[PDB]
Structure formats: structure tokens, C-alpha cells
Specification:
By secondary structure, this protein is α+β, with helices and mostly antiparallel strands. The chain has one domain: Alpha-Beta Plaits. It contains three helices and four strands; from the N terminus they run E-H-H-E-E-H-E. It has a four-stranded antiparallel sheet. Strand 2 and strand 3 (71-84) form a beta hairpin. The longest helix has 17 residues, at 33-49. It starts with 5 loop residues before the first strand and ends with a strand. The structure holds nickel (II) ion (NI) (3 copies). One nickel (II) ion binds next to loops. Disulfide bonds join 6-122, 25-72, 29-74. Keywords: Signal.
């Protein structure tokens, strides 16, 4: 019919930074924006590409906040538009951490993802 063989993924980076200076947490989090974009481009999107129906993700954006907390909670999100439903949420989450089922040391503990739309057209 009009079937949805794909779902939409939102990947997130979550980092806590020291803020003993008691500065604006948007400026503290800003310090690793470039680092997060480079991570997304050179590791995260490459890891997940083999699961995409038609390649494409949004620009990484930081969640804005209003606090100068002693520890700054920082969050970035990017959307991957079209991933085959063949690949479940856990399977995709795992792919962030390990690139072999017999890998001893996980990577990217600061990265997680969700299905942000459970029904999208694969376009393929
Ligand atoms: Ni159809
Ligand atoms: Ni539809
Ligand atoms: Ni100061």
C-alpha cells in the first residue's frame, strides 16, 4: 500500500563540563560545538550510513539553556531522515558504541539515539 518501511533517527551528544567559573552554560557548552560537529561528520554519520535507505541528516544543533550551573549539562541533536525499520532502536544505539560484536572497549558513551518518527517513506 502506502507503507512506511523506514523510520527517522535523532542522534544526541550529551556532555557535562566543569564550570567552576560559574559562567553561562551556553558559552561553556559552545566551546565544544566544533568538536561535536567534527565527531558527527567523521564518526557518527559514517557508523550509521549502512542503515540509511537514502543518505541525509540535518545540521547538528545545541539545546539552548539559561543557567550558570557549577556543572554544565550540554546536549546537541542531529536528525537522520530515513533508516530501514529492519534496524531497531537498540541495534542502532549499539552501533554508536561498537563496530564489532567481539569488541572489548565501547566508544562514544556521550552519544545515544531514538526513533523520532516511526513511519517515513524509504524513497527506494
Ligand atoms: Ni505506497
Ligand atoms: Ni505516509
Ligand atoms: Ni568569570
Amino acid at each position: 500500500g502506502h507503507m512506511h518501511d523506514c523510520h527517522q533517527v535523532t542522534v544526541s551528544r550529551d556532555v557535562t563540563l566543569q564550570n567552576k567559573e560559574r559562567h553561562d552554560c551556553n558559552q561553556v557548552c559552545a566551546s565544544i560545538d566544533k568538536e561535536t560537529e567534527n565527531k558527527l561528520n567523521t564518526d557518527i554519520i559514517p557508523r550509521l550510513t549502512r542503515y540509511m535507505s537514502v543518505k541525509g541528516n540535518s545540521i547538528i544543533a545545541r539545546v539552548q539553556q539559561s543557567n550558570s550551573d557549577p556543572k554544565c549539562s550540554c546536549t546537541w541533536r542531529a536528525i537522520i531522515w530515513r533508516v530501514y525499520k529492519a534496524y531497531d532502536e537498540n541495534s542502532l544505539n549499539v552501533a554508536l558504541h561498537v563496530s564489532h560484536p567481539n569488541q572489548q572497549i565501547g566508544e562514544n558513551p556521550d552519544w545515544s539515539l531514538v526513533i523520532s518518527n516511526p513511519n517515513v517513506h524509504c524513497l527506494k
